[PDB]
């Protein structure tokens, strides 16, 4: 009436009695969802435990910590003690909000967190954890499958610029599958990777594709022609390499290359003189430019591959 | 001494002109730069082609007679055991199945011409475990299921950001649904029998309302003194209004009718007319007055938006 009225976390707000009531103690009142809940404290800060009746005689508690720095609130079955939800709240914004099940099981848990981030974790009917989605404040999303054992099955993220991954692991846990999506429509694909880490690998261009293999410390994919062999390496963080060797032991024809990690180019030379560079470039793709018989210059203009058999060309 | 005929999936075949000792075509596809070559009694690119890798690995390409359908085929160096099957159709259409090293089924994607896709996942026992599936109207829907091949859980979300979350008890009958319209607004059933009965919540701005779900309906009910407000929802969503007052008192007993071309409950109290409840499409409650006899609305409309002010209304 002229109770005191207490401003909570998530939003809440409590009044407190000036009086003492029949038992010696401040009263407590709150309305969540139009039930009216009522408490008593010894506490004037707005502390306590307050609870409230539904028609069906489910029990709705509200419990604010003595320093008011989080609050919880249940609703219980008829029993008093089988949940049917629980929404804890602190002050720095952060919930928890649970769902249960008739056995008073976790139906499904969504966690605010001060990183912004959200998670809503999903459960079978059985209360076992089974399915995850989190948004990030990165604009990331994550899916992630949970099997019997609370292992992960597989695991899936998008980010903002559309570009994706996809991990599958075995039952024993390990990554056995890896796909991913690059923004640009390019892709790498990884199969049958062991548990040292080693696999098949492939890259999938416009119009072509590269194949090789997978170890733990990169991606090298090999295109073969005659005697040589160009192998572009992919490390973990997509920063690309790339190198040539030729067993033609003869010096007149023996390809040998030059990379430039600064401007992305592979310069092959032939009996002393440079032939063509490879541009390895920053939409994955490939040009060709020959030089001049001098070997000094490039000449004409710079050629985008579409093909396989058009790096095996300039292999040649 | 060839010709070449283009296949689904960017790929291509060459068919010689001649016979073989055999008695049949010759066949040669290059496939990621991987030589295939089989053999064909029909001369129009169709048939079975084949490739070996450096490790034995085994590429096979077959090509339907009616050159509508390609499948490759990643095996094992022992020729049985799938590590992959891709099958593109000339539509563009494919499924892409991944199998485990056993060479059993572990998921499969399909693209479809409606531009769909679907994603199904598949347990240790061969058995569908999860499926994504995306619309062409935007819709996506998340599906887990159960031992038996029953749902666990569904999980929907529209084009218009509307959601439906169902779950499903041990004997694969619906327990719980929650529904978010495009709003924001939300209906919780919650404790479902298998007769389809629960309690109901609606979740408005600026106030709930409980009650109670049948097959026929949800109930939600408002309270106040001898009057009780009841807001039906068919399954269809179409809301009706109902209102019963236990005072017997013709002085001050409140009667209510409903009509449904304008969403609207006239009350009545004395046999005059008192107020006009609104319930829109905006899924709001307004009020409006009548004159000091009854006759005609007065003022405008209000929106309420606490529960307090329905009680009041009902007063």
């Known amino acids: 009436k002229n109770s005191v009225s207490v401003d909570l976390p998530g939003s809440m707000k409590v009044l407190v009695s000036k009086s003492s009531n029949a038992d010696g103690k401040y009263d407590l009142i709150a309305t969540v969802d139009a039930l009216e809940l009522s408490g008593t404290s010894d506490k004037n800060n707005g502390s306590g435990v307050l609870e409230g009746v539904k028609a069906d005689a489910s029990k709705v508690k509200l419990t604010i910590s003595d320093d008011l720095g989080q609050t919880t609130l249940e609703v219980f079955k008829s029993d008093g003690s089988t949940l049917v939800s629980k929404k804890v709240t602190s002050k720095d914004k952060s919930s928890t909000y649970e769902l249960f099940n008739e056995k008073g099981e976790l139906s499904f848990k969504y966690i605010t967190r001060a990183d912004k981030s959200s998670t809503y974790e999903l459960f079978n009917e059985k ?16 899916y992630e499958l949970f099997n019997e054992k609370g292992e992960l099955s597989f695991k899936y993220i998008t980010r903002a610029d559309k570009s994706s991954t996809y991990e599958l692991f075995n039952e024993k846990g390990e990554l056995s599958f890896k ?6 429509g390019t892709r790498l694909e990884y199969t049958g990777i062991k548990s040292d880490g080693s696999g098949k690998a492939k890259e999938v261009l416009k ?8 170890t733990a410390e990169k991606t090298t994919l090999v295109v073969k022609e005659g005697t040589v062999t160009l192998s572009k390496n992919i490390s973990k963080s997509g920063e690309v390499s790339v190198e040539l060797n030729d067993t033609d032991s003869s010096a007149a024809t023996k ?14 030379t032939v009996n002393s003189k440079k032939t063509k560079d490879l541009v390895f470039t920053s939409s994955n793709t490939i040009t060709v430019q020959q030089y001049d018989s001098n070997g000094t210059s490039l000449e004409g203009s710079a050629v985008e591959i579409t093909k396989l058999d058009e790096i095996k060309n300039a292999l040649k």
Do not use: Q
């Open 255 to 268: 390809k040998t290359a030059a990379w430039n990690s600064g401007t992305s180019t592979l310069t092959i």
């Open 179 to 184: 796909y991913i999506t690059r923004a640009d």
């Open 207 to 214: 119009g072509y594709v590269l194949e090789g293999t997978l």
């Open 127 to 142: 209360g076992e954890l089974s399915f995850k989605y989190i948004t990030r404040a990165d604009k990331s999303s994550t």
